[PDB]
């Protein structure tokens, strides 16, 4: 049969890729390290507690000024905070109560959100003689919105539960490009420092590298053994980290095209909800289902600290652009700023 | 620093206006009860919607004795539910609609497997399930006079007998009484195995012509709220 021949040729090509990756694996990241000094003990304290959400918080995103913060909760509310003073700047009521993601524009003029209504809604924060209104609704996804990130004021990339990613023209509201190839629900996306590439993690235990201006998949990474929930780029753009339901974080290299490091412990048996890097990339912070956040040494894969202040599941995580503080959202309806 | 003091005064006033609005939203939020309507298209789930009265989710609002209820139905999502079902961990109850007549593909075993995963999911351990075994009239035709059989799909039905506390309907054949309570005991076997006093199952027999399911949702939800309030008296 012709279907059997294609499966044999695909199986042959997978062996060629695996041998090519094994040929370039002359050493490991642990061997290159293990002579450098360890990080030590990272002890952060809660500096701020943000209160006002009525239900569980699903997402948060820092502004580029490292002071303004937006969070999303399933009470149908979108709150913009001033983290230095804990004052609320805006409170946007949402048409759909089932928001699952939120984003902050790098210009600070817009905020996006979406969820189970399969729509990415854009809100203009700089309306002339008025409050915050809905600038644009982006429709076309046949599954729930899981992540969204602005490229600029007129472009945004979204993930969805219909195994696809899309690039939008906000002014016209049309999908410019569709990114296909995943076989499970896409859960997270992360943009490169230069907005030419992004990575996505899906429920097929794989991550893909996409080219924005050509709409094609360049590299596929298959280290994990369960659903990938979070993904984040390294600061230099040559690597990224993932968090999965197999109670394991992993680090992948783009130029070596394979996994480098695994961050796991025997007594950790819960999935990872969010991951982020510090400013230099030495620390890898991950939020877990056991209500805690663990600080990992990215180069040596030994745990350096614990952030334990939430009474329910940690759902989102974020580090400022200047590296001064981290923010954690949780299902107990509280946001905390750690330092 | 006169401008610095004025802009923080203006920022404090804008925070006060937001907090006043969030007080009104808190009163509405706790006076409203949210329900998830889950079921297949053939199960008669859409018939339950009219009894109470592209898009990713639909909402139905109804009021029983000055109490507001918001029921949500999943419109356009894939059949893989393990990710988006975590959003409904804080609803008052999950309304689960089962076609009791679909026992011969095995749709009844498929509904039992879905109920098992919902009952044993770690994020749904405190959520009660209101179970509606739908289309009893269709089950009546296929058991009394019809040649359709349930022992081939469920071999344990041969040894099963009607429980003594079961109340047959007026003008109901005994043979279809066994058919109804055997399907109910299939779900009660799952719920009582790991209930642990956190969540409870409320099974009901329903039909399209009933129009009394709206009251039974209200009564079960009242019992759910009562047992949530009872957990505060074991303070240690």
């Amino acid at each position, epitope marked *: 049969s012709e279907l059997d021949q294609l499966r044999q040729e695909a199986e042959q090509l997978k062996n060629q890729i695996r041998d090519a990756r094994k040929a370039c694996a002359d050493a490991t990241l642990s061997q290159i390290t293990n002579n450098i000094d360890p990080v030590g003990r990272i002890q952060m304290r809660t500096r701020r507690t943000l209160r006002g959400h009525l239900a569980k918080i699903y997402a948060m995103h820092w502004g580029t000024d490292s002071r303004l913060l937006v969070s999303a909760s399933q009470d149908g509310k979108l709150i913009i905070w001033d983290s230095y003073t804990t004052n609320k700047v805006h409170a946007i009521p949402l048409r759909s109560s089932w928001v699952m993601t939120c984003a902050y524009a790098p210009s600070g003029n817009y905020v996006a959100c979406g969820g189970l209504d399969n729509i990415c809604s854009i809100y203009n924060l700089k309306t002339r003689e008025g409050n915050v209104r809905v600038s644009r609704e982006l429709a076309g996804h046949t599954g729930y919105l899981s992540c969204c990130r602005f490229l600029d004021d007129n472009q945004i990339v979204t993930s969805s539960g219909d195994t696809t990613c899309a690039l939008w023209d906000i002014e016209t509201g049309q999908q410019t490009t569709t990114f296909t190839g995943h076989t*499970g629900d896409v859960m997270s996306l992360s943009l490169a420092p230069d907005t030419r590439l992004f990575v996505s993690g899906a429920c097929d235990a794989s991550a893909k590298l996409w080219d924005v201006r050509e709409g094609m998949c360049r590299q596929t990474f298959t280290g994990h053994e369960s659903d990938i929930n979070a993904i984040c780029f390294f600061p230099n753009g040559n690597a990224f980290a993932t968090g999965s339901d197999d109670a394991t974080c992993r680090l992948f290299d783009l130029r070596a095209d394979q996994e480098l490091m695994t961050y796991s412990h025997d007594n950790i048996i819960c999935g990872i909800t969010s991951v982020s890097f510090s400013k230099s990339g030495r620390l890898l912070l991950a939020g877990y289902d056991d209500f805690n956040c663990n600080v990992w040494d990215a180069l040596k894969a030994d745990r350096a600290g614990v952030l334990a202040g939430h009474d329910n599941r940690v759902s989102c995580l974020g580090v400022t652009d200047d590296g001064m503080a981290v923010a954690t959202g949780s299902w107990d309806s509280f946001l905390k700023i750690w330092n | 620093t006169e401008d610095q003091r004025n802009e923080e005064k203006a920022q404090r006033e804008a925070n006060k206006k937001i907090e006043k609005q969030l007080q009104k939203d808190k009163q509405v939020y706790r006076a409203t009860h949210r329900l998830l309507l889950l079921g297949a298209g053939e199960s008669g789930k859409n018939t339950i919607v009219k009894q109470m009265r592209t898009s990713g989710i639909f909402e139905t609002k109804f009021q029983v004795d000055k109490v507001n209820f918001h029921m949500f139905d999943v419109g356009a999502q894939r059949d893989e539910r393990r990710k988006w079902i975590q959003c409904f961990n804080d609803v008052t109850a999950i309304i689960f609609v089962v076609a009791s007549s679909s026992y011969n593909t095995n749709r009844l075993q498929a509904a039992l497997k879905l109920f098992d995963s919902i009952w044993n999911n770690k994020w749904l351990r405190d959520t009660s399930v209101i179970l509606f075994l739908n289309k009893q009239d269709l089950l009546a035709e296929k058991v009394l006079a019809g040649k359709s059989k349930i022992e081939d799909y469920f071999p344990e039905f041969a040894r099963y007998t009607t429980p003594e506390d079961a109340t047959p309907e007026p003008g109901e054949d005994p043979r279809v009484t066994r058919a109804k309570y055997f399907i109910r005991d299939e779900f009660l076997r799952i719920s009582t195995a790991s209930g642990d006093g956190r969540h409870y199952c409320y099974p009901h027999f329903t039909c399209a012509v009933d129009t009394e399911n709206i009251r039974r949702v209200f009564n079960d939800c009242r019992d759910i709220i009562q047992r949530m309030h009872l957990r505060q008296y074991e303070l240690l």
Partner: nanobody
Amino acid sequence: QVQLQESGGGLVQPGGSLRLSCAASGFTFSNYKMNWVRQAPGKGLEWVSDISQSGASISYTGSVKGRFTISRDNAKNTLYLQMNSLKPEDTAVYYCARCPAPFTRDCFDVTSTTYAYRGQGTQVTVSS
């Protein structure tokens, strides 16, 4: 790379026997509950049997109770399904399915179309 490969199917007379195997790789086999599912030539995907992480917790669908036996081998990472007294109604493509997450009591989407943690299946045909 999670991979499941099934083998053992074939043409068998009614009342005959078959043994199916499922070789697993790419994950820790002892942390997951395993399933067998099948697809008849006309109908959709149907759950058949499942076994827990250490065995000792076995359930079957009603039409195969007393005729099928599911077995586990954590040392060799193999799943088995012994079939006895085969009927023409057992003609299907049998798949080896894994539950999505480890250390979990529940398994959600093993019978869904386009499920990632399922194998390609083997054809079982019962005819006289």
